Amino acid sequence: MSQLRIAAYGPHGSGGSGGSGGSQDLYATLDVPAPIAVVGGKVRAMTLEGPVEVAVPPRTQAGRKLRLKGKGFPGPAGRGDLYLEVRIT
């Protein structure tokens, strides 16, 4: 119905609520193999609900974090950003 919405990989500044970061932003390690990283697909991410399938976009490169705005916890600026740490295996 609703997966972790990937607001990353579209660097486009405009008149909207982006900022330099979210409120309670958190880095969560995202394991992705080299094939699924380049072509895109799905991977197993760690969540409090258990292992979820995150639909990975194409072009995905090691060391880049998928900043998923609003997927972090609420705070001063509104909600935090969930950075999925692309680990190409």
Side-chain angles (χ1 to χ4, degrees):
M1 177 180 175
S2 52
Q3 297 185 329
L4 300 182
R5 181 73 291 272
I6 304 186
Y9 282 32
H12 187 92
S14 190
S17 303
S20 56
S23 304
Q24 310 302 329
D25 66 291
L26 293 179
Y27 290 71
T29 309
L30 189 66
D31 185 270
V32 55
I36 300 181
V38 180
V39 65
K42 284 182 301 176
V43 294
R44 179 194 58 124
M46 188 57 59
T47 304
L48 300 177
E49 306 300 276
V52 300
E53 298 184 290
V54 177
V56 179
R59 309 182 175 207
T60 305
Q61 176 59 34
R64 291 179 171 145
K65 286 69 61 183
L66 311 185
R67 180 188 59 194
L68 316 196
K69 293 195 57 68
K71 298 285 81 184
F73 289 89
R79 272 180 181 188
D81 303 347
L82 188 65
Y83 295 80
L84 287 181
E85 306 178 274
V86 176
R87 306 306 302 210
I88 294 188
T89 50

